[PDB]
Write a protein that binds this ligand. Sequence first.
Ligand SMILES: [Mg+2]
Lengths: 100, 232, 222, 49, 98, 50, 83
Amino acid sequence: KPLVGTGMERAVAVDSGVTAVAKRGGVVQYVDASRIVIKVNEDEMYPGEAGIDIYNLTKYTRSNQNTCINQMPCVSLGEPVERGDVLADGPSTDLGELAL
Amino acid sequence: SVTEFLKPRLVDIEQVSSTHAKVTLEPLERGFGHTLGNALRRILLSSMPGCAVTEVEIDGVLHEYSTKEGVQEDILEILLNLKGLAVRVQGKDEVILTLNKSGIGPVTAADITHDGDVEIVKPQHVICHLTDENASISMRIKVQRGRGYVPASTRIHSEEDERPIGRLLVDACYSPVERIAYNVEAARVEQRTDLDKLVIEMETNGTIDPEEAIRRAATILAEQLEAFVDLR
Amino acid sequence: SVTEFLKPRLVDIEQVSSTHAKVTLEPLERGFGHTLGNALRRILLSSMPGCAVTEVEIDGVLHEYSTKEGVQEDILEILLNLKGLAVRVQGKDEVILTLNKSGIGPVTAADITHDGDVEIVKPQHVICHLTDENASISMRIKVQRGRGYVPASTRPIGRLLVDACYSPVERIAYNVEAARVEQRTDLDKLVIEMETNGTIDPEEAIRRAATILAEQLEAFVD
Amino acid sequence: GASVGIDDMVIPEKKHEIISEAEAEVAEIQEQFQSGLVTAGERYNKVID
Amino acid sequence: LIEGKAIQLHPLVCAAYNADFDGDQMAVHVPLTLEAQLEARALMMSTNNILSPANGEPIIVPSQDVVLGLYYMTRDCVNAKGEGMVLTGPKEAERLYR
Amino acid sequence: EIKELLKLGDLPTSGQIRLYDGRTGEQFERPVTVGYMYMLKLNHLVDDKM
Amino acid sequence: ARVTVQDAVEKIGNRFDLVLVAARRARQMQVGGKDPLVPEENDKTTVIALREIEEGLINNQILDVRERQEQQEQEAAELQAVT
RNA sequence: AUGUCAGCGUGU
Ligand SMILES: [Mg+2]
């Protein structure tokens, strides 16, 4: 993270599609270095649905500049999450802040 | 006595913590304090023998850019934490430790099987975080003895076993000393009132005895200066 | 392998003069050039024991800013020349020398009253110049065996205190250059340039400094 | 061991007074222009000077 | 010969090259005849090129750090340590400073 | 505000500390400006240029 | 063992004929096996040629005189051997 | 064992 920043790191990190952002709130059912499974809340449940959100993080895939694109989780088991909260950190991102 | 110098000697070893410590050498004569402190600081920071993790082999992982089903941390991060493990090897130069963990929870440095000739200074150092109940991690760690910083690039100079696939390499920082700072103060010795004492504060990883470190640095300096003493 | 290290070699001595030398050592551990250079420089220019002039009594002169009619040089230059004088005393902590000279003024060190213990290495060191033929100069030099440079300002009306400069090393300068063996191009080569006043040969200064440091470190030798 | 620090760039203590005096002069010139005693080009040149 | 990946350039010859240690790249050519080597040594060497052919002004001038260092050395305080002392020569002054 | 935050910690207000020479060890004749700065590694690597 | 060629230039006086003379001498030593006129302190052929130019031991006049003498002597020896 | 087009960028 930048020790001195401007407060716009959060917006740049979230708006760019490099980080995994939870679609619906709930609790993190399963955490792994590759995938995340979230047990959604009953309020956001849809009828006739099991009610889990599955995020498959992209690990070590080349970018257009021959760099490495990597996504790392930043949540733990049982940690409640809300809609719009970062679940994984993309390349050059630390806890939802741009980290170049 | 003009042509006589009072011999400095070790008088105190204040172990503030298992790593932080302060050594005291006295007495010193009007300028030898700075010289000795600088020489010891420059020798301890560069030429302190130690042990560090050299090679890692995980049961299922085959290269450093993959992940294991169950571990919360990436394999590269796992090697990164393994690089920071502090260990003291007594008796030999090569040690093959084995770690075997299963079940939900962190994997600490206390999970490595006891070896008898190997001591762990940081038993609660984390390595990975198993998350699935039916997840097991098995690792084999080859730890060597050496000096300085030897990156993995320079250690593959010669191919003998051709490095079978699935054997990862981690750069080794063999230095067991992380910070050195010397301070020269005035001390009273036989009412001379012109003598100084040197206090060396050492922050290490806990795998080195500060008195042993000071004696080793002095030995290295004397062995180097014997060449000037001879001078062809 | 861990404790082998690297020992200096290629030790070659070149002599600009009889009191000037250069020493080159090619193989050294990385960074050890500075460790072995700065410590030796500090010991050589601040801890070498030697005999040197401390105070001088001028007959007919009370203060260092006065004037002596017969001599061309002022008191300041006389004190400078006395400080530049190199002496070697055996068996005596401090001795008193007497200088008396009248007539022409090519007053060198050869006119110092010999006392056997003192040995002026350079007897052509001009001390003063007497202009008037019918003039005389009488001086009482005091030489003491001390250690390192001791300025007179930090440290008997007629007596005048001169800077000590007990250290028998006029100039010491170390330099570190790149050096390579067995494809390791990071090694350090140490080049030491020394200029001695004349009491001892330049390599003796290095030998004595190294011996002093080894004696200091002997407590934790192993 | 030379270095640059934020305290090295010593701002003169009279800078604010000079700036305020210049602003007052500019305001007086502008007010005189508002009365029609001077034109736009002359007032612009005076402000620049 | 140096151990590394970048060409090491003399600080003084930068002004002639109009080069800065800024990511600028440069090219190396090897003259491989006796005549070419002699021409490089006698005409193209940096020691020969000390005056600008455009106007005769020198091209080797200290620019950034040499000037600052020499300016710091050649400067006088008013109450520095050892003021008013008398020294036999430059060697004594250097020893006193060190 | 920067000075207040510096004084909150155990750091000099002026932002300049007294450093020592690594090789020789003598104090630098003037205090120098040390601190923490954000550094970026650009995509211009020497191995890609040589 | 060479940094500048100012003295060699002032000896030749042209700075262009110097290059040709040094090249010819260097080719003589490298290929023709000519013994240098100066001690070789582990020096390249070009630097040796320049160094022996510095003290006037090699010049255009000296070079052509030497080669004329060499060719005359060798042709005389060949004629004597043939006859 | 090319070429060309287009774009981006670096150092001036
Ligand atoms: Mg540039």
